[PDB]
Amino acid sequence: GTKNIGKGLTFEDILLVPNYSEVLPREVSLETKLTKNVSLKIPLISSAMDTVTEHLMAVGMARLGGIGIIHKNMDMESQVNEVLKVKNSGGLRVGAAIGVNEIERAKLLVEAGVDVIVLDSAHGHSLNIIRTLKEIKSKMNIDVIVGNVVTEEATKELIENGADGIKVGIGPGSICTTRIVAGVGVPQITAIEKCSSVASKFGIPIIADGGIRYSGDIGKALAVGASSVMIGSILAGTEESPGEKELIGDTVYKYYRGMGSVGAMKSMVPEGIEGRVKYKGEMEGVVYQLVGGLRSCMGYLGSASIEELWKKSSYVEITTSGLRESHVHDVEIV
Amino acid sequence: MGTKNIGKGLTFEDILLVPNYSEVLPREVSLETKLTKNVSLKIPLISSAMDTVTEHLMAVGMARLGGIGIIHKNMDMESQVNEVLKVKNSGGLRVGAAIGVNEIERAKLLVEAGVDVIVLDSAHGHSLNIIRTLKEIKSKMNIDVIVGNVVTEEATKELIENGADGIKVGIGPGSICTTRIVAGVGVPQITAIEKCSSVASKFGIPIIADGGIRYSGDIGKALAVGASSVMIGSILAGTEESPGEKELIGDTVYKYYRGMGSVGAMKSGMVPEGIEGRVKYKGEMEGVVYQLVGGLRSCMGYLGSASIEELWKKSSYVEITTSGLRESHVHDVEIV
Amino acid sequence: GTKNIGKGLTFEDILLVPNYSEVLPREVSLETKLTKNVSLKIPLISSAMDTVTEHLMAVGMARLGGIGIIHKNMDMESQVNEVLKVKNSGGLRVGAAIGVNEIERAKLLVEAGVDVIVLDSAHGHSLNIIRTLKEIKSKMNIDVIVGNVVTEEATKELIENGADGIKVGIGPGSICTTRIVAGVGVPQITAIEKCSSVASKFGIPIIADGGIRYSGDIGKALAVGASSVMIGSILAGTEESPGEKELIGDTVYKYYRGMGSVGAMKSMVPEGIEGRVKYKGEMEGVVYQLVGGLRSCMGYLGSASIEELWKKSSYVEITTSGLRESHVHDVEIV
Amino acid sequence: MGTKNIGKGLTFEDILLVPNYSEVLPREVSLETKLTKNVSLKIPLISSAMDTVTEHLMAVGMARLGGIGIIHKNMDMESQVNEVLKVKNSGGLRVGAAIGVNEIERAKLLVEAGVDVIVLDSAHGHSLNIIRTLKEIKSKMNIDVIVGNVVTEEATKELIENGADGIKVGIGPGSICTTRIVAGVGVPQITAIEKCSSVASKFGIPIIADGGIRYSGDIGKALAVGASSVMIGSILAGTEESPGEKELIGDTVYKYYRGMGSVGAMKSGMVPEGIEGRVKYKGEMEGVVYQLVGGLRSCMGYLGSASIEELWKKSSYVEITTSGLRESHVHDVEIV
Ligand SMILES: C[C@H](Oc1cccc2ccccc12)C(=O)Nc1ccc2oc(-c3ccncc3)nc2c1
Ligand SMILES: C[C@H](Oc1cccc2ccccc12)C(=O)Nc1ccc2oc(-c3ccncc3)nc2c1
Ligand SMILES: C[C@H](Oc1cccc2ccccc12)C(=O)Nc1ccc2oc(-c3ccncc3)nc2c1
Ligand SMILES: C[C@H](Oc1cccc2ccccc12)C(=O)Nc1ccc2oc(-c3ccncc3)nc2c1
Ligand SMILES: O=c1[nH]cnc2c1ncn2[C@@H]1O[C@H](COP(=O)(O)O)[C@@H](O)[C@H]1O
Ligand SMILES: O=c1[nH]cnc2c1ncn2[C@@H]1O[C@H](COP(=O)(O)O)[C@@H](O)[C@H]1O
Ligand SMILES: O=c1[nH]cnc2c1ncn2[C@@H]1O[C@H](COP(=O)(O)O)[C@@H](O)[C@H]1O
Ligand SMILES: O=c1[nH]cnc2c1ncn2[C@@H]1O[C@H](COP(=O)(O)O)[C@@H](O)[C@H]1O
């Protein structure tokens, strides 16, 4: 078929191959770039969703060396106050999301000391987005991350128009139904590869957004060219997320919903669902495990930093049965 | 490899459409299309010619929303003419009707009743008897004829040369179809549309993608690789306007939906190649069709395509694995 | 690696592509060669298993135009009597299985009027199978089908030593655990193709043995080069099979076991299991559906005979996802 | 495509061995193999060095049947020496024992206690510390050393150059392993054996295939593609002789089986990379081993191979799909 441009791989399709190593998981540097001008101690960002990130989550993230993006599902004043709450909790970095044409919101956020603006849309590669980007860059001084995209052409054009970071991901989210409602998407490993191929030569960080299920996925995302990953579902279950708590049967769940779900849209046909995730308690322990798995990954790959990981990493493509071998098999877990 | 292996076939679940630079919003795209070389539709949806899907009410519903319904042939000629008359007496609405091989008298009566298109459908559209029936209709009356079902370039080419005004594609992909297991025969639906489109497009003859549409995203996929429209069965079978009977099983209400090649449908009036099944009741078709149209607009927005013609020009896809598909649907989260 | 000789396809991996057709399913001729000198009206053979084929099953198959192979899990006299019961019921054709070195059994079966001897082994391409074959051919005159094999070299050697039919299948059987226990096998479509590539040069019929689950599988097997197919589990649940009945809940089951199962061997680690299949009633109806399915396949393929089907057939490889589209989906059966 | 992609990795389930012309019966095949450069076994089976699989009882059982057990290191040096002595006090019986990085003193005490082989084991064999430890051992004591775990040509080559007497292959394939999930790291076991044996065989150094053996047929596969032996954990964990404790859950007796990188094994004395699980109780190890050896003989008979060396020369395999896998197992029959 003439329109077939190749096979796309997701996190589950691959495994990273071990390298000769002289570096322990504990010695690895997880320091990375959020945007061309902003640095992070760990490569973790909490999603801009109303069931994931408000001030409490963003303080937690920043204290752990990562960063939180305050969602835009609220008035400008309430969003500015969330930013101020984080800035008033010490010298802590914080970000905030805006939509297309939201120049006024952007200005007010920047006035409030926000470190990065995340200009996000279901379809980053669009005329309205590029215009908003250009308007912001000419009217205020701040780093702008733009998303969401999955192609080299999208990456190249956004960078040409002033993007300080590029957020990658259409379809891989746990609550996303874009692939089913619209039939559109690119498997996340392939999308990071394609965007990194353009972005890295201009020094522009890729944020891998969506579909992180396990700590092993973080390593994979960074290995193929991401500077950081944005995480929703894994954190929505923690104590510091704004979601409500409901007892289903005997276990407690936190609400977690796409920002393109009918409920999130009430507060276009939906491209996200309203779901539940198991409660996980303090985010600190959750994040510790995530950082733990990534250090372990970099130790296996003999990489003392993310930059080194990019030069040293390789992967094998596996089958669904190879996936069976990867997980736990034939043993009941206690 | 084996000598008889002609390559890998892809279905809807095997691919994903790649986003393009877009200057067009979903609300702005034109869904206008051609049903046949002489008949146009405002949206590219057709309801299946099945006795659990399309009679007069469903056809009226379809036409009002800009699509079309094909009245099934599991009824006497007079009953079928009358159903067509119902739709025609309800405004100036377009409507189709199905006929079987050699049913020239039925075709004539349907055309006189003001039917807009005849659908000459068979389980195996690439056959001598079908072609004979086609030639005879085209010589005895003046009307557009859609012929199916086929899955190959040679079949598409032969039908067009003999006067087909539209080509219906699909052997095996239908939800109620067991052709692939009873006969071992079929072609995955993406590959079949591509093969047939590669021939029909230069002739300007529309391809109807028939069967296996489960989600709105499949419509986008089907059109993107060369279909001008899609024909839909199971999705509409559960609606208020379909003719099937309703059964309460446990708590939920179900509607009957059966293949026209199941034992029950063949009794109405060879081993079966369809099953008799049930689908959940979904209420008014308007809300169902609104979603489908909505998802297709979203698709065309992502693809920067203001029209179906542009969609054919601009679209590309990636093939994905089973684990890729798991990432497409909902994962690790319990839906409410 | 260097030992990877390619991808192997089974029935479920492929679909036959429709051809231009001027032949109705009812007009299709199903006549075929069982062996070089024995013909059948339909290409169906009942398996040589103690839960499938004794005289009643063999009479049933022969009346419908196929053939039954009386199993060897009984003393010589008992097997001869089974053969005599079929021959006493008209001119009806019948076959009988023997094992390696079973020359006396062969002689007796032949004297009793058997039409074909099936020299059966787990591993047909072995020195002692060849020696048994050579010994049979020089001491009596009948057609001998030899199996089971899956390679070109096996087929060539057996034919050169006097085989009148070649039986293909290691691993694909419903009750077979050879692939799990020994790690050995070849997917059935690839095995038929490989063996047909040699046998057809010599006019020697291929029997496709094991793994038929639906009538569609029969068409596939014949399409890629088989002259007939041997069937076990499908017939094992019919009233004519020797198996015993057992009520489980509200469903009636017939026992069905591999001849390499623990229970059959005491009638070496086992390579088959003891199982149950659902009771399907009269065998005539079952066979009607199978024949019906094959006629439909040959109608779609414009082939008026198996010979024409070999000439005209072609197939497409499908994915697991493709297979979900083949079966029934999203609709619950009544 | 994607530039960091080194190719498709195959696990045991992805392949099937192809039968060869055979003149050798299963009962006639020789299963004698080299454990290390200087140590031979009667059968190519090793019990895993885990605290729910191998202590003295298991090690004696393995040795009697022609294989060997590796005493785990989750105990003090004295306790470990004592296990080794018990096996040695039970006839002229082979035994191995594991040590970790820098555990030179432990190694010395084990060697003077008469251990036949030292297994220098780490989650990541291809590391500077492992190599240092290896060189240190080879210079201070006379003993065969098996090093692991690795999955690459370069790792295999470097370990051999620094004095390894055997190479243990396996990162991610074990039943209780979560390395592939937690760290995202691993190589499918067939591919890993092939790559490592491509180097090791040139030097005549035995490859041990460790983890992911689920059925006897997997042993055949592992050896066929170049392993000289296989290490097994879960299969032996449910036997009488494993040191794990029993627990009744429901109406079935289970024994505990846990990774040595599970939170409970590390508490026993980093983020965990193994789980704490349960396997069904299976009685005597002798019966279990008989079946395993039985399957391997059957495999070598199908391949016309009278010895493992001949099996390396003669073996070939075909890749299968998950649908081919369906066919391999039992299907459509309810097992009694
Ligand atoms: C309703 C849907 O919502 C989302 C989809 C995906 C991710 C989401 C993340 C957060 C919140 C909402 C999300 C959507 O906006 N869909 C959609 C589809 C196609 C579009 O195409 C365009 C567009 C095309 C050309 N110019 C401007 C916009 N916007 C689009 C929006
Ligand atoms: C029983 C089966 O019914 C159907 C199968 C598939 C789709 C259906 C949709 C609506 C109604 C019935 C359907 C069938 O007609 N099977 C069948 C199979 C092969 C055939 O081959 C020919 C044929 C070949 C050559 N010339 C004329 C007809 N008709 C055939 C019919
Ligand atoms: C126990 C197993 O049984 C069967 C396996 C597969 C199909 C069956 C069908 C009917 C009855 C029993 C069957 C078997 O015989 N396995 C087996 C495995 C390897 C062998 O290798 C040889 C052999 C090798 C070289 N020369 C002669 C025989 N016989 C073998 C038998
Ligand atoms: C906690 C984890 O434990 C295990 C993982 C896999 C297999 C196991 C088998 C038995 C016992 C524990 C196991 C681990 O050690 N992970 C880990 C991950 C990366 C590492 O990288 C290095 C390392 C890198 C460079 N030089 C020395 C060591 N050690 C590492 C350990
Ligand atoms: O409803 C929506 N539809 C599709 N994607 C969404 C929606 N809401 C949020 N997302 C994306 O999904 C990501 C979260 O992915 P997760 O970690 O896999 O749950 C977010 O960071 C957004 O990029
Ligand atoms: O019994 C039959 N066997 C095979 N296909 C059928 C049968 N009856 C209807 N169809 C086809 O299946 C389509 C419906 O597919 P669905 O939308 O996937 O439910 C119809 O438009 C016909 O092309
Ligand atoms: O126990 C056994 N192990 C392996 N194959 C067997 C055994 N018993 C019978 N077979 C084969 O399996 C075929 C039946 O396959 P089925 O039709 O798929 O049930 C028989 O005709 C034999 O070739
Ligand atoms: O906790 C762990 N994480 C990963 N691998 C382990 C762990 N503990 C033991 N292993 C490995 O897994 C093997 C057992 O694999 P199994 O036979 O598939 O159960 C052992 O011999 C070790 O190589």
mmCIF file of C-alpha atoms and ligand atoms in Angstrom, chain B residues 123-124 127 179 260-261 270-271 273, chain C residues 21 23-25 296 299-300, ligand 2:
data_model
loop_
_atom_site.group_PDB
_atom_site.id
_atom_site.type_symbol
_atom_site.label_atom_id
_atom_site.label_comp_id
_atom_site.label_asym_id
_atom_site.label_seq_id
_atom_site.Cartn_x
_atom_site.Cartn_y
_atom_site.Cartn_z
ATOM 1 C CA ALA B 123 -21.368 -12.914 -1.628
ATOM 2 C CA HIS B 124 -19.048 -13.176 -4.624
ATOM 3 C CA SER B 127 -18.788 -13.926 -10.970
ATOM 4 C CA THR B 179 -17.030 -16.567 5.471
ATOM 5 C CA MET B 260 -28.333 -12.299 5.537
ATOM 6 C CA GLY B 261 -26.403 -15.554 5.179
ATOM 7 C CA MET B 270 -25.650 -23.975 1.095
ATOM 8 C CA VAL B 271 -24.148 -23.862 4.583
ATOM 9 C CA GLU B 273 -21.830 -17.882 6.350
ATOM 10 C CA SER C 21 -15.607 -17.601 -10.925
ATOM 11 C CA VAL C 23 -18.513 -22.274 -11.032
ATOM 12 C CA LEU C 24 -21.232 -22.532 -8.395
ATOM 13 C CA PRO C 25 -20.331 -24.338 -5.139
ATOM 14 C CA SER C 296 -18.125 -22.541 -1.031
ATOM 15 C CA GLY C 299 -16.804 -21.376 -5.651
ATOM 16 C CA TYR C 300 -15.062 -18.195 -4.412
HETATM 17 C C1 LIG E 2 -24.254 -18.732 2.079
HETATM 18 C C2 LIG E 2 -23.430 -17.513 1.706
HETATM 19 O O1 LIG E 2 -24.162 -16.329 2.025
HETATM 20 C C3 LIG E 2 -23.500 -15.133 2.161
HETATM 21 C C4 LIG E 2 -22.113 -15.101 2.311
HETATM 22 C C5 LIG E 2 -21.454 -13.876 2.428
HETATM 23 C C6 LIG E 2 -22.176 -12.685 2.390
HETATM 24 C C7 LIG E 2 -23.560 -12.716 2.244
HETATM 25 C C8 LIG E 2 -24.283 -11.525 2.217
HETATM 26 C C9 LIG E 2 -25.666 -11.562 2.063
HETATM 27 C C10 LIG E 2 -26.325 -12.785 1.944
HETATM 28 C C11 LIG E 2 -25.606 -13.976 1.975
HETATM 29 C C12 LIG E 2 -24.222 -13.940 2.125
HETATM 30 C C13 LIG E 2 -23.144 -17.519 0.234
HETATM 31 O O2 LIG E 2 -23.972 -17.047 -0.530
HETATM 32 N N1 LIG E 2 -21.961 -18.049 -0.108
HETATM 33 C C14 LIG E 2 -21.437 -18.174 -1.356
HETATM 34 C C15 LIG E 2 -20.127 -18.642 -1.434
HETATM 35 C C16 LIG E 2 -19.485 -18.809 -2.656
HETATM 36 C C17 LIG E 2 -20.187 -18.492 -3.806
HETATM 37 O O3 LIG E 2 -19.743 -18.585 -5.040
HETATM 38 C C18 LIG E 2 -20.763 -18.187 -5.873
HETATM 39 C C19 LIG E 2 -20.746 -18.122 -7.262
HETATM 40 C C20 LIG E 2 -19.611 -18.501 -7.979
HETATM 41 C C21 LIG E 2 -19.635 -18.430 -9.370
HETATM 42 N N2 LIG E 2 -20.733 -17.986 -10.005
HETATM 43 C C22 LIG E 2 -21.836 -17.609 -9.336
HETATM 44 C C23 LIG E 2 -21.869 -17.665 -7.946
HETATM 45 N N3 LIG E 2 -21.811 -17.849 -5.066
HETATM 46 C C24 LIG E 2 -21.483 -18.030 -3.760
HETATM 47 C C25 LIG E 2 -22.126 -17.855 -2.537
#
